[PDB]
Amino acid sequence: MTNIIKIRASVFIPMSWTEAKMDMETGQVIQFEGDSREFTPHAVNTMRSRVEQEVVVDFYKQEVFSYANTGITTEKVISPDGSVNKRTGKASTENIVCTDIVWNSGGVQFKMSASASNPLNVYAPPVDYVLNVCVKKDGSIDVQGEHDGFPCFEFYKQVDFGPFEKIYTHDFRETGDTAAALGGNMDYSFTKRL
């Protein structure tokens, strides 16, 4: 009846630039580039997110396909001498996976997990989410998510090439949270049936 059902996850920083840090050792002032954008599902391959993942369940084919990416990190360093210098790196995508795919008569389930650190500052703990998602042949979905409290998170489902539907969003700046929340374990969780 319904053929293709896609789940999209995005992790992004809304600001142009992260919170400024100063190292008295070097005299520098450093910040990393953001994604300069609000919430939206239309940001694929746009490089306006730190982590991006899409799983596509294909019932016609009896297949799960996954797509995983990380944005580019740019650090802006202002030297004592005043000069500014940018450096570029890209997080690994080794730990953005789609795992534990299990089939039954009327659907499939799997877990999506993402862990990506900042390639240019190693002292930083990685962002993490994991969702346990169950999809039925009818089209409706059933998700159990956890994620670090920072930065912003957005999840959408899109079925048979139609319009996108909001699964769940987390807005750190509405929530009181900060980059501290990236350490520890995954502070938040949610349940959602669409």
Which segments are annotated as binding site for Mg(2+)? 126, 128, 148, 181-183, 185, 187
- Nearest-approach distance from CB 73 to Mg ion, in angstroms: 16
- Nearest-approach distance from CB 61 to its own copies, in angstroms: 40
- Residue 181 binds which of Mg ion, its own copies, none (CB < 5-8 A, kind-dependent): Mg ion
> For residue 146, which phi and psi values (nearest 5 degrees)?
-130, 150
Q: Is 135 in the site for Mg ion (CB under 5 A)?
A: no
Q: What residues contact residue 140 under an 8 Å CB cut-off, 6+ apart?
A: 193, 194
Which C-beta is closer to its own copies: that of 18 or that of 53?
18
Which C-beta is closer to its own copies: that of 166 or that of 173?
173
Which residue is it, tokens 């499939």? 108
- Residue 89 binds which of Mg ion, its own copies, none (CB < 5-8 A, kind-dependent): none
Q: Is 171 in the site for Mg ion (CB under 5 A)?
A: no
Which stretches of 70-177 are DSSP H helices? 172-175
Burial of 161 (0-12, 13-18, 19+ CB in 10 A): exposed
- Residue 148 binds which of Mg ion, its own copies, none (CB < 5-8 A, kind-dependent): Mg ion
User: 3-state DSSP call for residue 180?
Assistant: helix
CB of 124 closer than 8 Å to CB of 115 = no
Query: What CA–CA distance (Å, rounded) separates 155 from 34?
Result: 19
- Residue 128 binds which of its own copies, Mg ion, none (CB < 5-8 A, kind-dependent): Mg ion
Query: What CA–CA distance (Å, rounded) separates 139 from 101?
Result: 17
Structure tokens that stand for 23 in this block: 């190292």
- Binding residues (CB under 8 A) for its own copies: these are 16-27, 29, 31, 78-82, 84, 86, 117, 121-125, 178-180, 183
Which residues contribute to the site for Mg ion (CB under 5 A)? 125-126, 128, 148, 181, 184, 187
